[PDB]
Structures are given as C-alpha cells and as structure tokens.
Design a protein around this motif. Sequence first.
Motif, PDB file in Angstrom:
ATOM      1  N   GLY B  33       1.083  -0.970   0.018  1.00  0.00           N
ATOM      2  CA  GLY B  33       0.159  -0.094   0.081  1.00  0.00           C
ATOM      3  C   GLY B  33       0.841   0.943   0.016  1.00  0.00           C
ATOM      4  N   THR B  35       0.886   3.391   2.988  1.00  0.00           N
ATOM      5  CA  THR B  35       1.031   3.271   3.877  1.00  0.00           C
ATOM      6  C   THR B  35       1.238   2.061   4.888  1.00  0.00           C
ATOM      7  OG1 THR B  35      -0.714   4.760   5.304  1.00  0.00           O
ATOM      8  CG2 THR B  35      -1.139   3.236   4.120  1.00  0.00           C
ATOM      9  N   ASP B  36       1.923   3.144   6.176  1.00  0.00           N
ATOM     10  CA  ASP B  36       2.169   2.151   7.340  1.00  0.00           C
ATOM     11  C   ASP B  36       1.147   0.773   8.330  1.00  0.00           C
ATOM     12  OD1 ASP B  36       0.753   4.679   8.472  1.00  0.00           O
ATOM     13  OD2 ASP B  36       0.686   3.329   9.849  1.00  0.00           O
ATOM     14  N   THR B  39      -1.738   1.989   9.734  1.00  0.00           N
ATOM     15  CA  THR B  39      -3.126   1.839   9.038  1.00  0.00           C
ATOM     16  C   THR B  39      -3.864   1.255   8.832  1.00  0.00           C
ATOM     17  OG1 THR B  39      -1.480   4.051   8.932  1.00  0.00           O
ATOM     18  CG2 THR B  39      -3.505   3.811   7.339  1.00  0.00           C
ATOM     19  N   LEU B  40      -3.178   0.178   8.064  1.00  0.00           N
ATOM     20  CA  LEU B  40      -3.170  -0.889   7.414  1.00  0.00           C
ATOM     21  C   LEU B  40      -4.249  -2.344   8.034  1.00  0.00           C
ATOM     22  CD1 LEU B  40      -0.763  -1.751   5.155  1.00  0.00           C
ATOM     23  CD2 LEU B  40      -3.301  -0.244   4.310  1.00  0.00           C
ATOM     24  N   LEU B  43      -7.544  -0.674   8.790  1.00  0.00           N
ATOM     25  CA  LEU B  43      -8.749  -0.577   8.002  1.00  0.00           C
ATOM     26  C   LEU B  43      -8.474  -1.585   7.622  1.00  0.00           C
ATOM     27  CD1 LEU B  43      -7.378   2.389   5.636  1.00  0.00           C
ATOM     28  CD2 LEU B  43      -9.045   2.565   7.190  1.00  0.00           C
TER      29      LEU B  43
ATOM     30  N   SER C 190      -7.021   5.269   3.110  1.00  0.00           N
ATOM     31  CA  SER C 190      -5.988   5.922   4.605  1.00  0.00           C
ATOM     32  C   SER C 190      -6.217   7.298   5.111  1.00  0.00           C
ATOM     33  CB  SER C 190      -4.319   6.030   3.760  1.00  0.00           C
ATOM     34  OG  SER C 190      -4.101   4.114   2.896  1.00  0.00           O
ATOM     35  N   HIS C 191      -5.517   7.538   6.153  1.00  0.00           N
ATOM     36  CA  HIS C 191      -5.688   8.961   6.539  1.00  0.00           C
ATOM     37  C   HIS C 191      -4.734   9.696   7.484  1.00  0.00           C
ATOM     38  CE1 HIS C 191      -7.486  12.694   7.543  1.00  0.00           C
ATOM     39  NE2 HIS C 191      -8.453  12.857   6.235  1.00  0.00           N
ATOM     40  N   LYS C 192      -4.648   9.769   8.199  1.00  0.00           N
ATOM     41  CA  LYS C 192      -3.666  10.912   9.496  1.00  0.00           C
ATOM     42  C   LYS C 192      -4.104  10.082  10.085  1.00  0.00           C
ATOM     43  CE  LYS C 192      -0.364  11.880   6.857  1.00  0.00           C
ATOM     44  NZ  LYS C 192       1.445  10.474   6.887  1.00  0.00           N
ATOM     45  N   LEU C 194      -7.059   8.304  11.540  1.00  0.00           N
ATOM     46  CA  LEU C 194      -7.817   7.270  11.490  1.00  0.00           C
ATOM     47  C   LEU C 194      -9.484   7.521  11.850  1.00  0.00           C
ATOM     48  CD1 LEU C 194      -5.933   4.694  13.299  1.00  0.00           C
ATOM     49  CD2 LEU C 194      -5.521   5.491  10.381  1.00  0.00           C
ATOM     50  N   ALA C 197     -10.647   8.268   8.295  1.00  0.00           N
ATOM     51  CA  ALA C 197     -10.451   7.194   7.066  1.00  0.00           C
ATOM     52  C   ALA C 197     -11.639   7.281   6.953  1.00  0.00           C
ATOM     53  CB  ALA C 197      -9.726   6.871   8.010  1.00  0.00           C
TER      54      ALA C 197
END
Lengths: 334, 334, 334, 334
Positions: B33, B35-36, B39-40, B43, C190-192, C194, C197
């Motif tokens: 992705g 992103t980190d 975050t993954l 989600l 994704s978003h800073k 969450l 997001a």
Amino acid sequence: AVKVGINGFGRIGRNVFRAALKNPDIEVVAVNGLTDANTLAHLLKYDSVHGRLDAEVSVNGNNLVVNGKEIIVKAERDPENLAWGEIGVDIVVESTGRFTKREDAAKHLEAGAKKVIISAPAKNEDITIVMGVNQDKYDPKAHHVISNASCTTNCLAPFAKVLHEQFGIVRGMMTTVHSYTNDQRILDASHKDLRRARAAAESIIPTTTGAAKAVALVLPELKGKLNGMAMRVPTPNVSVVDLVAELEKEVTVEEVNAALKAAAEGELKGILAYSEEPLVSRDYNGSTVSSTIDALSTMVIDGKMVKVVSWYDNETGYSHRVVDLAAYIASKGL
Amino acid sequence: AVKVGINGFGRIGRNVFRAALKNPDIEVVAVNGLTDANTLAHLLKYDSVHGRLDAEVSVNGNNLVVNGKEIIVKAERDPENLAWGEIGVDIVVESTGRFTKREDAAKHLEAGAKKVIISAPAKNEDITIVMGVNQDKYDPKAHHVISNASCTTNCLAPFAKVLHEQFGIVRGMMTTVHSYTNDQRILDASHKDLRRARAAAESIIPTTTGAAKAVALVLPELKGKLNGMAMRVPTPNVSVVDLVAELEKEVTVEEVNAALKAAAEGELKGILAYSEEPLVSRDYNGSTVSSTIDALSTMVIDGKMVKVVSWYDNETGYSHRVVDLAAYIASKGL
Amino acid sequence: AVKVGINGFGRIGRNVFRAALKNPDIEVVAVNGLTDANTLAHLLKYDSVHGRLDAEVSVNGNNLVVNGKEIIVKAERDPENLAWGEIGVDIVVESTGRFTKREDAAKHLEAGAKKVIISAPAKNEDITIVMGVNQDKYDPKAHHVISNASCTTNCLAPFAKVLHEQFGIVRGMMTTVHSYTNDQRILDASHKDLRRARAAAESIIPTTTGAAKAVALVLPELKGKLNGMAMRVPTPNVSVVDLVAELEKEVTVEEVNAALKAAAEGELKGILAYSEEPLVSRDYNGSTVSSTIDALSTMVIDGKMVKVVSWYDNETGYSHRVVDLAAYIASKGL
Amino acid sequence: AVKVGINGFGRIGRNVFRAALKNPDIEVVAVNGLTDANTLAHLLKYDSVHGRLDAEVSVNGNNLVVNGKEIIVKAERDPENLAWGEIGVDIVVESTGRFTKREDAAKHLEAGAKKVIISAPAKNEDITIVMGVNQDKYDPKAHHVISNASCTTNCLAPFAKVLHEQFGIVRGMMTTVHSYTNDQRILDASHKDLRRARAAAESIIPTTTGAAKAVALVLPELKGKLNGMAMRVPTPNVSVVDLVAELEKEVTVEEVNAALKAAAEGELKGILAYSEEPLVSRDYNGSTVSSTIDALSTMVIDGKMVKVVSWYDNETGYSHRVVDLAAYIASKGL
Ligand SMILES: NC(=O)c1ccc[n+]([C@@H]2O[C@H](COP(=O)([O-])OP(=O)(O)OC[C@H]3O[C@@H](n4cnc5c(N)ncnc54)[C@H](O)[C@@H]3O)[C@@H](O)[C@H]2O)c1
Ligand SMILES: NC(=O)c1ccc[n+]([C@@H]2O[C@H](COP(=O)([O-])OP(=O)(O)OC[C@H]3O[C@@H](n4cnc5c(N)ncnc54)[C@H](O)[C@@H]3O)[C@@H](O)[C@H]2O)c1
Ligand SMILES: NC(=O)c1ccc[n+]([C@@H]2O[C@H](COP(=O)([O-])OP(=O)(O)OC[C@H]3O[C@@H](n4cnc5c(N)ncnc54)[C@H](O)[C@@H]3O)[C@@H](O)[C@H]2O)c1
Ligand SMILES: NC(=O)c1ccc[n+]([C@@H]2O[C@H](COP(=O)([O-])OP(=O)(O)OC[C@H]3O[C@@H](n4cnc5c(N)ncnc54)[C@H](O)[C@@H]3O)[C@@H](O)[C@H]2O)c1
C-alpha cells in the motif's frame, strides 16, 4: 382570478401553493388540512428541499395570511363537509391521496365546487390530462373530476410523443430512478409493499410503477407498447426516466437529439427542455418543466434501439402542471 | 499453496484479502500500500460496510499478523521495485487502479511474479476473464497479464450468456444503478469526469460505463449488440444491472425465469443465483455470487422485449471471483 | 477597487468568489487551481450545495469570463511562480489548505502580493483575526500574513465574547456537530486521522478540533479556559456549535438570551444572529452571518452552568468573513 | 422457561425477539402486531440495519415458526382482548409506544399477564429500572408494571453512577448525537415537535430529551443535577452521549478513564464497556452493552470540568437490557 381550494396540505399541496403564488390567473383562498394553522404556516415557510418561501407568512386566528391575503384554513376529514361553494371556490386540488376514485372525488362537487383536479392517477375519472400531450381533449361540459396523472407519466409522455410521431415506437421498457416519497418508511416498518417497507435512505429499492401503462390514457397509440418499473434511491427529490425503445425508422443519436431539441424549442416549450450539460440530480431541484432530456446520454444500437434519459423534479415540475391545468380549465369556462 | 501478493490494499485489495482467508488453496504472503502497517491493520479490522474482520489481526514490527500468519508489508510506489521473486510471490492482484495498461502491469512480471490479475478492465492484456463464462479460454503458456474485468461486466455476462444461448439477444441496452466508489468526490471537486466531480452522496449521477461493450471480450458473439450507461446513487455498496433486450424468440416471464433459474442451480452455480423474494440492496451486502436474478422484476412486452434485473455486491462478489480466478489459473500450472 | 487573487479554487475558494461577486469594493482578478479553465468554469457554475451561480460564466482561451470581466486562470503548483504583483493582485486569499505555515504563505508576498489571508488556522502568521471580535488589533504596517481562523472558531468567538464580558466564563467545553468536508473519505481509505479515514456519509465520526483553544488568540482572556471536540456527521454543509460553560454570575435563560439578542442587534450585528424559531440545519444553508443562536436550546442548571447552541453554514458564513476581512484590510491602507 | 409475549413488533419489538433467541431463561411464545404473519416473518428475517436473521423463519398458517418453535401471532389493537393468560404468558414487553401510562399497560395484566415491561419511559409505572444501576430496588410483590427507561438513559446512568460515586457530580449537561427513529418524518410533514417534522436524513435536528432528568429516577442523589438535549442526525442507528460535568473532586484524564475502565471490567461488566480504539458509529452497530466509553475523547479542564463520550446502539443495547430485565424479574419468582 378563479378561486381555488387545496385539499391535503402535504408535499404536493404545499408545492402547488408555492407555484400558485406567482400565477395571475388562479387564486388560492382556502386550504384543508388535518392540522392547525401554526403547523401549516411553519411547514409552508420552511422547506428542507426547496428552502424558505419568498413571501411573508403568518397566522391570523386559525387562518394563514400570505403576502397580505388571508387564507381560510379548514379541518374537515370528510370532503362533502368542506362547503367550497359558500366561499366561492370553483376549482379544488385533491392532493390528500385518499380520494382517487371518482366517487370520493365527486364529493367536493357535492360541497359546491365546480371542478376537481386529482393530483395523482385516478380511478373512473372523467379524463386524465398531461399538459402538452392531450389538454386539447378537455371538454368543460363532460369533464369535472380530472386527473393530472403521475409525475413519472408527465416526464415520459412528452418525449414519447416526439419519438413516436417522428420515428414510431414499436415497443419499450422504462425505469425511473426516483427519489423517495412520503409513502415509504424511515426504518423497516409495515407496508402493503414489502419493498417500500424498508428504510428509504439506506437502499436501492426496486418497486412498481403504472406510469408506463398510464401513458396510453394520453397517447392511445402507445397502448400495450410500454411497460416499466421504479427504483427508489436515497435522494429526497428529483428523479430520472430511462427509456429503451425499438423505433420503426432507423435513427442516429444525431437525429434523435435534434428532434427532441426542436420540440423543446417549439411545440413543447416549457414542458420539455433539452440539455447538453453533464449535470446531476441536485442541479434539477427547482426546475418547473416536466421533462428535461439529458442529451449527453442519448444512445442507439443497430439504428433501431434507442436510449433516452430525462430529468424531472417530481415535486416542483408536477406542481407547476397542476397550476397550469387549473388555469387552462378556468380559461375554458367556469 | 499458491503464494499471492496484493498491490494496492484498498476497497478491492482489502476484500480480496478477506475473501482469501477463506480459500485454503491460496495464501496471501505480502501486501503493498502507500502507508504504514498500523493504518493497514486498522482498515483491515474495521470496515464501515462489512463489519469487523473476524480474525486475530495485529502488527509485528512492520508486518501484519493475521491468525498467526505474518504478512509482509511494503510501500513501493514503483511496481518495478516490488521484488516479488525475492519473497516467492507466484501471483499478484493489481488493485491500485493505476496500472491497468500492459506496460505498467507487466512490471510485476519483471519483478519476479509469474502472473498478474488486474482487478479492473485493462489495456493490452493477454486475456480478460469472467469466471463462469470464458475461463476455459485460458492458456497457461500465453496468458500472463490477465484482466478480471469490472464488477458490472461480471454481473452482466453470466445471465446475458444464458439469455443468448437460450433465446438469442438481437440487441440490448443496460443501466447499472451503482453505489458510489472511492473514485468519486465527497464534495464538489476536480475530476476527469465532470459528473463524478459532484458530491457523491447528494445526487443521482449519470456516468458512462464500458462494461456493456466489454461483454464481447467474453462472449464474442455479442460484439456490437449491447450498450449501456451507469448511474451512481447515494449508497456505499451493492449495485443492480437493468438489462432490456430484444430477443430472437417469443418467450414468457415464466420461460425467461425458468431458464435463469435452471442455469443458477446448474452450470452457473455459485456465480449466478436466482431470487423470488422482494429484497432491497442492503440485503445483498456480503453476497459472494457474481449475479443474483430478481425474479419478481422480470417483465416482457410482445414476448420479444425483455427486462432482467440482477443484483451484485460490487466489492464482495467481485473479490471472490479474483480469488477464484487466482486458484483456477494456479491449478492450470505456474 | 482592490484586486484579489485566489489560490486554490475549492469549496472555500469558489464560495469566496461567489461572496465577492456581491462586494464592489473588491474585485477578484485571478484564480489558481490545479485544473483547466473548463473544469473551474463548471464547478463554479453548478454547486451541489449552493445551487447554480446567478451569473454568466464562460471560458475564453485559458481564462474565465464571468459577467464580462475576464478572470485570469493560473495553474502553478508552486506559489513562488505566481507573480501576483505582475497582475496587480494586492490581496491573496490562500485557500488550498497546503500553505498554512508562514514559510509557504509568505511566498505570495515574495511573488508580489501585498497581503495574504489564510482561510484556515496558521503557523507563524502575523495575526489571527475573527471579524467582529478583534479586527481592531490589525496593524497594517506590521501585519501582512493574516489568518482568518477556522469556521468553528468564527462561530464560537463572537458569542463566547458576549457571554464572557457580560457574565464571565470560568471554564467551558464545546462540541461541534459538523458536516463532512473534502478532508474526509467517501469510503474507508488511508488518512492520518484514523477516524476521518472512514466512510463519511455512513457514520458519526468523533475527531479533534483546535477551535476551542484558538479562541484564545482573538480573546486572550479565555486562554486555558476552554477546550472541545468535533463530531462529523452525514450532512454536506452547515454545522452547529454546542457550548457548556460555568459562569461567574448566576443567570437565567432569559438573561443569557437577552444579552445574546442585544449583541445580535448591536455590536455584533451582521456577525452574530439570534433566532427563536424551531429550525433545522438545512434552513441555515446559505446564511452569511458567522453565528446564529438557537434561542430555544439555551439551558441553565444551578444558575451557573449554561448551554448555548449556535448554527453556522461553514462554507458561506466563513467565505463572507474572508471577503469582509479583505475589505477591512484594504481600507486600513494597503 | 418464562414465557414472554411482545406487544408491538417494530424496531424494539423485533430486536427484543432477536436478542431473546440468545437467552436461556425466557422464551417468546406470542407476538401482537397490527399486521399479517407473512409481513412479520419478512420484517423479522431481513433487517436493513442488522442484516439477515440466522435462523429458519417460516410461517405455518397464521403462526410463525422460528427454528422449530411456533410463535402465536395476534393482531389486537386493544390490549384487554389479547388473552395472555390462556397461553401461559407471564411477562409482556410493551413496545408499541402507545401504552405508557400505568393505566393502559395494566390492561395486559387484566388479560392474564403477570408482569409488564414498558420499552420506554412511563407514566405512573410501579418502578423504572436501569440494569446495572438499580435493579436491586425491584420487588416482585409491589412492582408489576416496570419501565426500562429510554436508550439514552440506559447509556448515561451506568457511567453517571461511577463518576458520581468516584468524584462526585456537582452538575452537568449532555447532548446525545442520535440516529433517527420511526417517530420522525421521511420528508417535511406534520408532527407535534416542529423539529421532528423535518426530513430526517437531510438535517442535523435539535430536539428535546428527558433522558438527563430521568437519571434521577434510578440515581436519586442526582436529582436536579443534570439536563441535556438531543440532536437527531442522518444515521439509521447507533448514538452517542456527550456528557460535560463539573466534578466535586479534582481529577485528571487518567483518573477518570482508569475509573471507568475499572467499572467496565468489574461491577458493570456487560453493561458498561471501555474502548481505547478510534472507532466510528458503524463500528458500534450490533453492540450488546448499554454504554461504551470512548476513552480517547475524555477531556478535562481546570481539573474540575470533565467530558465523557459514550457509544450506544439504541436498538441492540436496549433490546438486550429488556431481555436481561425480563430474565432478572423471572429469577425473582413470578
Ligand atoms: N411526493 C411526490 O413526489 C408526488 C408527486 C406527484 C404526485 N404525488 C401524489 O400527490 C398526492 C399527495 O402526495 P404527497 O407526496 O404530497 O404526500 P404528503 O403525505 O406529503 O401529502 C398528503 C397530505 O394530505 C393530507 N391529508 C390526508 N388525508 C386528508 C384528508 N382526508 N383530509 C385532509 N387532509 C388530508 C395529509 O395530512 C398530508 O398533509 C398523492 O396522491 C401522491 O401519489 C406525489
Ligand atoms: N470498489 C469497487 O467497487 C471496484 C470493483 C471492481 C473493480 N474495481 C477496480 O479496482 C481498482 C481499485 O479500486 P478500489 O475501489 O478498491 O479503490 P481504492 O481507492 O480503495 O483502492 C486503491 C488503493 O490503491 C492504493 N495505491 C494507489 N497507488 C498505489 C501504488 N502506486 N502502489 C501501491 N498502492 C497504491 C491507494 O492508496 C488505495 O489504498 C480500480 O481500478 C477499480 O476500477 C473497483
Ligand atoms: N470547507 C470548509 O468548511 C472550510 C471552512 C473554513 C476553513 N477551511 C479551510 O479552507 C481551506 C480549503 O478547504 P476546502 O474545504 O475548500 O477544500 P477543497 O479541497 O475543496 O479545496 C482546496 C483546493 O486547493 C486546490 N489546491 C491544492 N493544492 C494546490 C496548490 N498547490 N495550488 C493551487 N491549488 C491547489 C485543490 O485543487 C482544491 O481544489 C483549507 O485550509 C480548509 O481547512 C474549510
Ligand atoms: N427506536 C429505538 O431506537 C428505541 C429505543 C429505545 C426505546 N424505544 C421505544 O420503544 C417503543 C417502540 O419504538 P420503535 O422504535 O420500536 O418504533 P416502531 O414504530 O418500529 O414500533 C412500534 C410498533 O408497534 C405497533 N403497534 C402500534 N400500535 C399497536 C397496538 N395498538 N397494538 C399492537 N401493536 C401496535 C406498530 O405497528 C409498530 O410496528 C417506543 O415507545 C420507543 O420510544 C425506541
């Protein structure tokens, strides 16, 4: 000029009111509702879909006062008690949704009115009219209980009229992707129609429509050649008709779109509009025409099957045709 | 068995994953992705449309841990730098939506992967497959960059195939009333498509679709016979195809339905389904099949024109087919 | 008279333009957006929330023509190459949301602009101003990079000032039930943040706000006394601030409302408003003031704790203030 | 074993049934709803908010068959004629929202029931019970008509108890950002409350709540110390309570949360929950607890003014509490 009375102060009732304010020929002098004047004045002033009314609204006793004129506010659940005749009301707009049978609608006539316009498809009505397609069939002597048809039938009939006259419609299916109405449910709750029983703003809800079969009442030639369904979606107003049809003469997008454009600029001006802009539903909110061709969506396959998409603000456009029919009727002799 | 990697962990990337947890034949070993891992993980665990993922999900170092299995997390903008070969990835699901052309998708091959499944309509691909329709055309030797087509094409092709074989489609048009996707805008903003530039949750948005003519890639016999459009409406997931076709034979609703019902329980089992209940879009959220015929909506005019309406969870159904395609391909030999 | 340039023609940039069309003292001469003139002309003409622009809009070359005046369209990603001075631009509305820090905002000054107004909370700005509250603290010699604060701070400060001057705020908490903005996602992505997001139109989403603490910049006495949060909900525009505070004086609902109403008709006329009608958010879409008290919601407990609720159309009210600031600045001496 | 009957099969009625399926102590044997057995089975099977019911639902004659157990279906507008006695029904869940005065509910006892639980605040009830807060005050001899309070009251009381017993509440305010319910209008229509008269899915709608005051019914030491309001927003389910309180003891964000976490893991286990994850409303859909502390939102000012935000699924959390109450009552002898 001609006094008018509205029965059922709901979405259509209040919208025909707003439309009638800026019409010189008609005059609404009395409304009937099952609620107090204050609640009615509030619902007329503020509208979630159409905004604040462009007029000063107030309540004098149990009467409303709009732009200086006092409006008689009745609360009779039974139509024959309305006494329209005593206050001079010649035409009554029946928009409660409860009196669609000529038997019931005729009670207004017992009560003194001269003409009744049912804001919905009716049963046993003297005549069904679609301004722009058959208002010429109106006879002041043989027609007293009149149906203005449905909002869907008003959007579809004008353009089906042009495609048929120009190319000849052999057969076709239609689908109206329609905003939700007060006949649905906010959350899953009982309904005669199991689809409409479901939360309106949460799903794509397939449902039935008689608008397709209804066009034949105004366009006899099309009897048996059209059918369709509805799909109610999560928007509060504005709907779109999607007609797929087999034509008799081979056509091109170019031809089809020119024929509609020509009618929109000529004969059907005011009822049928034509657009080459890539607009969306919110853009049609407040349009007074009955049908607007989305030109960018017109397509053809093998020169004989066409797709025509038309927009219509179901509340505003229809309300303007009710006011139009009333002024047309009055002109015919009251 | 087959070790899979996913490029682009978005709506489709995450559902392919959820769909894969089920199939034991395949095994996701890495995801990429932008992103980190934290975050993954989030989600992946909480989904606004499908609910919490039922599994133990955590972050170990910079890798994902799901039910004991460590999944490699990368963040490579450039697919040429993915190094699939290093980690033994046999197949790659290309679901970023940025690499649909053979020139970009092929970079996965250059990086050491044996096959690439493009989760969308592609360009210059070796082959486009719609499970249940043309997987048989798959040549392990020649096909390396394969497109799994679009959610709509996967819905349409299966039942159109049945109507064609049984009655023969002369020509037809379609409209997919579609839920909104991440491709649209939350509030009015720039977009290549001026329709999609408008607030997704506020309107009915007409937009074009290539799915209708993209059917000829899987059912060549139908080239030049179908066409259609899309209408994005305010719903987060689930869509419906509305097909109006001109048949070669005279049929009845009972016939058309009996045919679709026979196919659903027979050859197209698991891909095509049949329903006689009056359901709504939220009821098909989580549906894994490709297409579900709404029997109650089947209509016919003159015995020749037909209307068939079919439902499909655009994220779930489609994601299950990717996993299916991946296990089929793998079975043919890698 | 004053020439304004807008950097970033988005939700705030376009609405600022619209508001500016009203004011003859200012004249927008150039806009910069990362898209073509045709797309800007479309987005400017049709708005999903605020309707169609009451103006003739057209494209001439790479420029916008609105009511005859030609607006220069720029497409510079880097502020440095904007050359505002070359085109006479005196004031620059910085509305991209990417250059809120002095280090980037000042690039406009270096490109030839005399003043910069940041349409959001800034960093290292010369002064943060909330019209009606502290515009008098503007020194035209010392201040060139000005922040206009957030829409929320703009809503809260004018009445927080009144409650304080009159009763004295000991401490208070606030929650703003806010419409969603372009900073959120239509679907889980994704978003800073969450929380931000998650699918915007599907949930009540708690998130942080600095508005509460930011009131300290315009009302130094309230530093360390307030704090608050935000709740993003599924509506496109219009928000409401909910303040709960401890006062020094013991009051009553009539006292609090009387002081708020007084200010609405006096000092804060045009900025702060008063309402005793039982309205809803959709009723405020289009309001040009910064704050409107929902008088019917005012509450008190023990005569010391009060609850005040104020409405604000986050797009229109704020954009009107931006134009109000540009006009006040120009008059001070540019 | 304790046979239960549900009066009124709507959002709460159907959800109490679903919850009841997971309980060992009670057993729903009959349901009264103003509709046919077919409609009820459909509405029970398919829910737009909670999905498909995982159990075999069928209809045998006028009765329902859920997992082999038959349920008597009644359609009695008048309670006196339900004859609960003839069919062994001991407890009756009153969830029509029409019979809330002890006088009406008591008709059930006349009809043979022994106990009545009103799924809503009542008038003159023998006792109001918030499980986890005061169920110990129940007396099997003296209390026959019990109110389970509102969903908002069930969410707030459990944590109000802890905050009060731990730090002492001087006074406080609350706002519940609440999902819409069947008492609202789909589109602008009449209603006692002019705010609930407005289109539910289109606006942020302020309204009144008695939930704050009702806490005093189960937590007498809190009489006259709290008050609040509600704000209906466009979500079909899940709500949140935003409490701002002036504490007696000086505290810190850490102490407050450690306190609520402790209760959640201890005494209030099952009623109060504690979350340190940045979730959104959709994540709480299906939650069986009465109140879940959004730990990340806890805020403190001057070590005296705290703000606690708690989540609650107004349909699921409340429905489980009704089932728990019915089972609690049963254990106390009938
Ligand atoms: N809603 C639309 O988009 C739309 C468009 C075209 C036509 N229609 C038709 O218009 C009619 C009204 O529909 P609506 O959508 O305005 O609904 P609505 O529910 O908003 O309007 C109904 C109004 O009539 C009132 N009422 C009902 N019975 C009454 C009685 N016996 N006496 C007095 N008042 C009574 C109701 O209180 C309500 O105010 C229906 O026949 C409908 O199918 C609706
Ligand atoms: N969502 C649907 O309903 C649906 C259905 C069928 C097919 N598709 C197709 O699948 C594709 C993905 O669609 P989506 O709806 O899942 O959208 P999405 O926006 O949720 O997924 C895209 C993901 O790819 C990520 N990404 C972007 N560039 C990347 C890069 N260079 N490297 C690694 N990761 C990157 C994005 O950050 C995002 O996380 C599109 O081509 C779309 O047409 C979508
Ligand atoms: N929308 C509101 O409710 C509101 C109110 C007050 C403050 N704000 C602030 O207004 C600013 C804009 O917010 P918005 O809601 O209008 O956002 P938006 O996303 O609608 O518009 C921002 C515009 O900036 C443009 N852009 C991005 N980078 C650019 C660049 N380098 N050069 C030129 N143009 C560029 C984008 O194309 C976009 O159109 C933000 O700082 C936001 O915090 C928003
Ligand atoms: N909706 C929620 O989230 C919620 C939560 C907690 C408490 N409550 C309360 O529970 C009660 C029910 O609310 P609801 O949300 O289920 O609404 P609802 O409209 O879904 O349920 C009411 C049901 O009772 C039926 N009914 C009406 N009169 C009846 C009668 N005379 N005899 C038999 N059946 C009758 C109706 O047809 C309907 O199905 C209300 O008092 C409400 O305040 C609601």
